[PDB]
Design a protein around this ligand. Structure first.
Ligand code: NAP
Length: 177
């Protein structure tokens, strides 16, 4: 089949091996209320000395600034939350990107296909990192109703499930130490 599926233990080993992690959150994160386990995951991984930051697209979510507000409300410190144009240049130097409920905001067809409906629209360049894990329930579309090439790239693994079920489980496995 055209994409790669991984399990939770594969994801934990990828996190463990990464020094630098960027989370790119989208609508799926807050649809699932996954902000709460994620804020604890990030605190634990930061305590293990990893560089853990968020890269948030200005149009992520369904309301302006929605991911920024909900992550702040959940306790994520403002100093590790960056704007797209502040963080995009770092993706080639990033060991692991966690795409959590984002799709349109990380869709490479905006740069790779000049005849795409989203051609020319700015995106987060997550496919330039060493390893991408996409957390969503299916191989299906987001708001713009288009396919996303990053799901079939060789450095992408799909971690399929509801975002809060997955992140609760990853929080538990990291808490194991
Ligand atoms: N921010 C705004 O104010 C605003 C306003 C108007 C339009 N928009 C548009 O909406 C989009 C925002 O980009 P985005 O990357 O945040 O999101 P998105 O590209 O619309 O994709 C969110 C996708 O999240 C997954 N998802 C939904 N519920 C989930 C759950 N419970 N667990 C796991 N995954 C879940 C769905 O895939 P599955 O069904 O496979 O899980 C979903 O594809 C852009 O096209 C933007 O232009 C934003």
């Amino acid at each position: 089949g055209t994409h790669t599926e991984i399990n939770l233990d594969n994801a934990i080993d990828m996190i463990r091996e990464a020094n630098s992690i960027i989370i790119t959150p989208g609508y799926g994160l807050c649809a699932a209320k996954a902000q709460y386990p994620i804020a604890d995951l990030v605190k634990m991984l930061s305590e293990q000395g990893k560089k853990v930051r968020f890269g948030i697209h200005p149009v992520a979510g369904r309301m302006p600034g929605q991911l920024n507000v909900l992550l702040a409300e959940a306790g994520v410190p403002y100093d590790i939350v960056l704007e797209m144009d502040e963080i995009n240049h770092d993706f080639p130097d990033t060991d692991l990107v966690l795409v959590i409920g984002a799709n349109d905001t990380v869709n490479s067809a905006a740069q790779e296909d000049p005849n795409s409906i989203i051609a020319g629209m700015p995106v987060l360049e997550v496919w330039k990192s060493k390893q991408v894990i996409v957390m969503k329930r299916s191989l299906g579309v987001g708001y713009a109703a288009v396919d996303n090439p990053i799901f079939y790239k060789p450095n992408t693994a799909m971690l399929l499930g509801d975002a809060k079920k997955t992140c609760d489980a990853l929080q538990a496995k990291v808490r194991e130490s």
